[PDB]
Design a protein around this nucleic acid. Structure first.
Lengths: 133, 92, 347, 64, 358, 61, 128, 90
RNA sequence: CCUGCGGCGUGCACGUCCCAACUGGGACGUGCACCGGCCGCAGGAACAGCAACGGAGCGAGUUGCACGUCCCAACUGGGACGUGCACACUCGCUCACACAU
């Protein structure tokens, strides 16, 4: 089965910061733990883009394997402008499994809620420490 | 209705509900052009003409109670001589 | 490689900008002419004249039409006119040459350019081996009968070459690269390849990989690049991105045979005068009567497209006459001064 | 969509329907990103492209 | 700095002067080769837009004014080959210069409907054959055969094979191979037109003292055309015609058929103005007032080719003026027509409008 | 038949009766294939030759 | 050897049998010779049988020159859906056909005696 | 009637008795040959060699044998069955 | 006077039958090629002209896409409500009428 050190090699050159393996487990758990509340986690390029435009705070998780990059290369900069932390994930299919829809989504917007306050805070802190190139 | 008929060509193969006929006469048939048998029996209309400019084929849409499995190898087909053009017309 | 101030002659003649390339390989009729301070080199024009005399090699998106991708560029660049030299279907991507303003004069000349597509074909039924599809593509070659997809004037168009790039048996979906003449309908070609193979088939995806001498490796830029270049120009006054995106129109005439004219003959040609032998500084081997040529200034600009009325040997063996008649003037009038009527006689 | 590709040593497009190229690396999709004229993300795309060195200007110039 | 940057920032303009304008015409096709080296009588005339370059003619005119170097198949006769080409190309006329016996392969120049006027001029062309012979009884050693061949190098005596004894020359000869066990040898012979190499083989046998005969023959060169000079097979002609009649492709037919001017590249050239082409076609002698260029070395009663400035062979003529006289004269007939090759009315009638004529 | 040949470096024909050239390769027969005017295999002959880069149009010059 | 012989063959000698497939082909030709009308040998007979419509397998010899004597028959076989494959030499074909004289090409029909081997060779060729 | 010296015996190619020629006249085809005593030994069969220094091979009857003549044996030929050399010269 | 044109039973290939190589043998039918001088027809009687009065540039005639807002069940396909965007000749105007030192 595909590893985590080769799957990362398969991503594009703009997938930075890229969550390490441990942080990757954390984000998948956060997405699964947050899929619960339907309206507190957005899915889709158009939806995430719209919510970012109107300014919904949270965390933005990208997919490392995207091509052509011109479909989402503008979102990292918008997140930087609006002070919305973000990171990339090694593969999109992993995210799709994280939501249990079998159709990997390029990006996910994870907001804050009481039920997963601790996991959300830990992931956000880890992401902030990772830094932006 | 067909005052006269000339042999358009011989039989080719079958592609679903169509019968490709290899055309021997140089003249290029018309589209939606009736293809008759020897006894002036309309079987279908031309749908697509493909191939080179001197060795080409024509697909016919058998319509009024006719089948592709009806015809068989080496069978010949007729066409109205007035429903043709010269090869030169189409060519440069 | 080369220091910024090295003399132009220190670089071999085979590395000059786009219409001066291999100028020493041309037949020299005379070297003596009085250079004028007017005109600009094709690649050193100001930004205001680069856009007007430029073309873009756009990678057309999937959904929009070709007339909508050309209107978009006109709106983005705020240019007065913009055209293209071959229509790509609304659902078909690939190369699209978009001429900007003064370059649109070449659109007609680019209509007959040979095209190269990469098509995806789905077969309704299955074949026994890929060799069947390869042979079917082999017999769908040369001049072929084609009907425009849903006028209806059966036309004859040539497939010069083709090559089945890939085939998936489980999906019964294949990819084939086709070299064809301008006007060829690859949708009809896929239908005919289906009919020939006895199973049927249709085209489910297309992508033009070359339009004439321009391809995907030759400076192809997405529409995002055009949009980004304009924003950089307006909000940053940087012409690096805009010059990368837009290329001079001389890049569309590099394959044309050349006849260099003196600076005293440029304006006369721009006013409708025929190219005359006394004004030819250099001419190229292989010029035949009724052949489309490009008149080029001494700086590399394209004065006009002309039809040759004298072969290379005839130019080499005559002292005067009409070397070529005009077909389409590209250069604007009054770019060079009026200097006709002051020749050796002037009588 | 169906048409993907990889590159050889000469940087030429080899067209395939396969998601993995002969060398194991993923195949890049052959179609450009969808364009909308009312796109106000020119500055953001330039920032990111520049940060990762994917801009047209940053590449080596052609030899026309 | 990268070469692209230097191109975008450099001047790169043609220099105002170099002081020399030498032409390099050594690579120009057919009768335009070394066109600059020809003595230039005048540069003043008005070219006409009629006509094409020999290699850039339309297909109809290209075929009508062409020739084929055909590898003759072993079994048929030369006239069968000529007739077969006629039927394949659907041409009114076809001919050939040298006749190869039914069993002899090799070079065979076939003219097509206007090069047939050059068949007579090709009859005297030299011929190189490669012939296989068998000796009735064994010889002492190979040096004997080499000496025997070295004795048949001259204006030899040859009577046609199965009777007016003639004299025909054998310029060179070489024993390429000799298998002693079977007593079968292969020798290459350069010879004059009309020579019957079967007679040579029987004579070589007589010379060796044992006798001999010819088993095979293969013409390896007819004039300036040989095996490497674009020789094509009969299958090539048929395939080229089919590609042109089915796929409407001309490249194959253009590789097969060659311009008739390829047969006249060994002739000295006199280039004439486009106003004198039609006069020459109608029979007018090539007059000095219409000569642009000429090739040095022209002697009296010498075969030359009258050519247009486009490279088209208007005619074959016989000179009545030397190169020195043609440089030092202003009037007088430069050449006398021998065979008009160009079709009439290809160029307009422009004789009679000059100053002296009126 | 009797005549055969092999090509030297320069490209000239070297004629011989031997089956094997000095370089170990076979010697090509000197004589062309027999010709039938009623040959209906022109298409089949251009396909195979083109496939293998032997057609005249595919050679240089 | 075998690699050398394939080296000497002409460029149109494709698809080519390897050593093992070549032994199978020679065994097939040797077995088919026992039946007079079920093996066709020579250029004219094979060409005529293909024209009429006879079926089976066509085996070529790649060491022939000039190639214009047989260059078309591979395409004829493709048109009629007749499997074919080249072999290194004609002498091997001749030696397998009980004739020291070489055979340029041969065509094998189907007989119940050698159905298994003919079907093994057909499958092996079709997978090339 | 009379005879003139044709040449000497040079070799023998089967029946053919090859006589080298020293004269500048070339005889006819099947032209009869005769010895010193005007005895016919055959008729001309073939005429080969260089234009000037050439040879003639003659076919003899059944009453004569090629080996019957020794080296140097001289032959006579008819002076009325010869052509001028200037005719065959170019 | 000059030129162009015309006249003054062997083999070959294919198809079909017998026998004993990229073959030679036989037979039957198809087609294909062969075993310098004079005359007739037709074209012209040729000293090879022409360093600008026809060219160019404009204008007219001969449903999908993108965005936003909602419903629903990937770089998505669906609906609705509005926004913007695309779907060779002649006839007129202007410029010169240019052999480029």
């Amino acid at each position: 089965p595909q590893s985590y050190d080769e799957k990362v090699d398969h991503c594009s050159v703009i997938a930075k910061p890229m969550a390490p393996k441990k942080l990757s487990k954390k984000i998948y758990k956060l997405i699964k733990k947050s899929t619960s509340h339907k309206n507190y986690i957005r899915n889709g390029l158009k939806i995430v883009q719209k919510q970012l435009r109107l300014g919904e705070k949270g965390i933005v998780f990208f997919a490392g394997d995207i091509s052509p990059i011109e479909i989402m290369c503008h979102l990292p900069a918008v997140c930087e402008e609006k002070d919305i932390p973000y990171c990339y994930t090694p593969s999109r299919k992993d995210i799709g499994a994280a939501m249990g829809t079998m159709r990997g989504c390029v990006m996910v917007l994870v907001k804050e809620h009481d039920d997963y306050k601790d996991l959300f805070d830990e992931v956000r802190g880890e992401i902030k420490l990772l830094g932006h190139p | 209705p067909p005052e006269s008929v000339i042999p358009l060509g011989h039989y080719g193969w079958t592609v679903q509900d169509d019968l490709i006929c290899k055309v021997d006469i140089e003249d290029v048939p018309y589209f939606n052009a009736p293809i008759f048998l020897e006894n002036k029996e309309q079987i279908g209309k031309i749908d697509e003409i493909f191939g080179n400019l001197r060795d080409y084929f024509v697909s016919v849409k058998m319509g009024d109670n006719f089948k592709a499995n009806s015809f068989k190898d080496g069978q010949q087909f007729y066409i109205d001589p007035a429903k043709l053009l010269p090869l030169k017309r189409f060519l440069p | 490689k080369i220091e910024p101030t090295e003399s132009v002659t220190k670089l071999d003649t085979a590395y000059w900008p786009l219409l001066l390339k291999n100028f020493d390989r041309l037949n020299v009729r005379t070297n003596h002419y009085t250079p004028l301070p007017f005109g600009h080199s094709p690649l050193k024009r100001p930004i205001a004249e680069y856009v007007k005399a430029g073309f873009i090699n756009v990678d057309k998106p999937s959904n929009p039409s070709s007339h909508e991708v050309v209107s978009w560029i006109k709106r983005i660049l705020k240019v007065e006119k913009t055209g293209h030299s071959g229509t790509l279907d609304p659902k078909v991507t690939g190369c699209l040459i978009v001429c900007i303003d003064r370059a649109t004069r070449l659109v007609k000349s680019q209509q007959n350019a040979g095209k190269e597509y990469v098509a995806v074909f789905s077969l309704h039924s299955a074949v026994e081996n890929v060799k069947k599809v390869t042979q079917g593509l082999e017999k769908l070659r040369g001049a072929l009968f084609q009907r425009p997809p849903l006028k209806r004037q059966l036309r004859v168009r040539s497939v010069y070459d083709s090559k089945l790039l890939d085939f998936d048996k489980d999906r019964n979906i294949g990819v084939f690269w086709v070299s064809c003449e301008a006007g060829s309908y690859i949708r009809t070609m896929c239908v005919h390849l289906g009919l020939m193979l006895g199973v049927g088939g249709q085209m489910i995806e297309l992508r033009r990989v070359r339009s004439g001498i321009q391809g995907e490796k030759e400076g192809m830029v997405t529409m995002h690049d055009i949009l980004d270049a304009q924003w950089a120009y307006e909000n940053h006054k940087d012409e690096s991105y805009l010059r990368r995106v837009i290329k001079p129109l001389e890049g569309l005439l590099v394959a044309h045979k050349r006849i260099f004219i003196k600076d005293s003959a440029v304006n006369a040609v721009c006013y409708g005068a025929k190219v005359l032998l006394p004004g030819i500084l250099r001419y190229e081997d292989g010029i035949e009567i009724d052949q489309e040529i490009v008149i080029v200034t001494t700086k590399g600009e394209a004065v006009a497209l002309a039809i040759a009325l004298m072969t290379t040997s005839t130019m080499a063996s005559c002292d005067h006459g009409v070397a070529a008649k005009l077909k389409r003037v590209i250069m604007e009038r009054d770019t060079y001064p009026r200097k006709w009527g002051l020749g050796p006689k002037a009588s | 969509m169906y048409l993907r590709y990889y590159l050889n040593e000469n940087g030429d497009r080899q067209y395939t329907l396969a998601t993995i190229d002969p060398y194991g690396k993923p195949t890049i999709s052959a179609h450009p990103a969808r364009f909308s004229p009312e796109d106000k993300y020119s500055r953001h795309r330039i920032i990111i492209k520049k940060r990762f060195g994917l801009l047209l200007t940053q590449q080596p110039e052609p030899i026309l």
